[PDB]
Symmetry: C2
Subunit: 316 residues, 2 copies
Amino acid sequence: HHHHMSLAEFALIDRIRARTLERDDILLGIGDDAALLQPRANEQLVVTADTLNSGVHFPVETRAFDIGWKTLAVNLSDLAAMGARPAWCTLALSLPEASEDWIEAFGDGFFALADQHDIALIGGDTTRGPLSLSVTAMGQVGRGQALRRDRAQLGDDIWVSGTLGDAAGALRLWQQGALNLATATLLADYESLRLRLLRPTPRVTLGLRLRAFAHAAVDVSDGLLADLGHIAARSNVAAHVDADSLPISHALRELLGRDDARDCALRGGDDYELCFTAAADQRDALHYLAESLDLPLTRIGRIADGQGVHVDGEAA
Amino acid sequence: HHHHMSLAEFALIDRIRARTLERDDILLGIGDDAALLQPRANEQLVVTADTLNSGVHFPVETRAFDIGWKTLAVNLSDLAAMGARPAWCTLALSLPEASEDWIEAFGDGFFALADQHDIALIGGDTTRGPLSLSVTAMGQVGRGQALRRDRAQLGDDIWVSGTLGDAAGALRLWQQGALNLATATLLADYESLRLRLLRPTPRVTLGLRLRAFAHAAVDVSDGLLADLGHIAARSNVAAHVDADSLPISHALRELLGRDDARDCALRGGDDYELCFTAAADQRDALHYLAESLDLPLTRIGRIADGQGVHVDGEAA
Ligand code: NA
Ligand code: NA
């Protein structure tokens, strides 16, 4: 055994081709074993890759649709933080056993998210092994248009999209035995947290607009403090966070205690939100942008002389 | 846990940067979290992806250097069969435990092969999980220059590079208890087979020249019959193989019986040779090419009216 199945053999090939037929930058005919891709000549390519392993990056009971969604969402969130326009991706699936129905359901979730951001699956592998999903996503950026982590400026405001800590809250409730991840619950606050863990929303549209407003950006996937820490270190500045200002969802505040909710918001994994810095005179414009996107953008802190990320004045 | 480590955090980042510094199509500075890639404007990109899983695609005792070599070799062999020029790749490593020395040795093998074909590692992931290595390789082709599986012509000769069945022979000897894969042996024929399994040679240089000579091509990784089968099916022709003509190495003939060696050559996994078809009047030129490349090219059969791959006249 150990055969590698590339394109044409993919269980998803019909849905793959349906999407390449409507893309003038992808040549993939019925009788084609690999796609020919046409980059934009004056743009640059950026490439991200992430592997999600069963039991590590998702609880084993996570359903196929949610695995398909989240595997792509991680990569799209990476591309968002660079302000890159998603173009193409590959998918390398390791499965212990053939399961036609599982792959179809995985494809449901993958394409549900992929279609929203016009990223086209154009190749990959299906082979035997412990359940592991590796996605490589390719995006494009105009010259000098990429967002970076090293360009925060003294006096900048710090901003973050969406809400922080929901996924960590769902994970904690699941570990305490209070939340089933494999089925939908009618209890609205639990279901909200469940879907923030299972189906994070990559802020691609925001990322594509931030170049016009922001100085530096990072995606928040290892917790706000860790990821803002990359901005502070790469930019050679201090970052100050006002913990009271953090955007905390209704459900997180309702279902977790004050301290646990705060810890989730500051240090929780897997938010897949965007944290960025902007000149103070962008405040009006960023509030307008949040309304335009129907996406919360919350001013949470400031960039200042010194080093390290601070919470309420303390960097220790 | 479950953190994803991308570029800048890679244990291999110093060797990565040493190689991007000498590539004018890759922008990756010391203070850069992701590379910007510049495609050739008039060329098309093709992308391949393969995952190798411990115990599945390589015996668990395979050493780190050989895992690094073979993981890339699979992808380069895919690119070779398309006549694509390798450009860039990503590497997504799942490791059960941090091991600095293992990753360094893996990098030795990866870069040993990558440097020979001027393919640059430009990103990827390192994360926790059962040992699994997923590589995405990006190559480029001029307009209409890609080799294809569907263009064999009636009357073509069938050709194959190198030798067939060595890797399968080593695997059989290992399964019978006669070959240790984790250490070098001084016994020359065993060592030859061992390295054909552990370190296959992707025929990239051949692939880049075949467009000038060949009609159709495929890489042989699931055995000659399976892979030539793709040419026959996609081209709507019969392929006839003369089994007596197959290139069988000294070591394979010496260490396996006549029947086992024949079965390895016809159906053995993991040769990573190239099988192609060419007009009969290319015979002189292809012998000259083999001399030029110091690479055996062996005429093994013919394309004819009918369907399916035949051995000594039989397609059953
Ligand atoms: Na198309
Ligand atoms: Na360079």
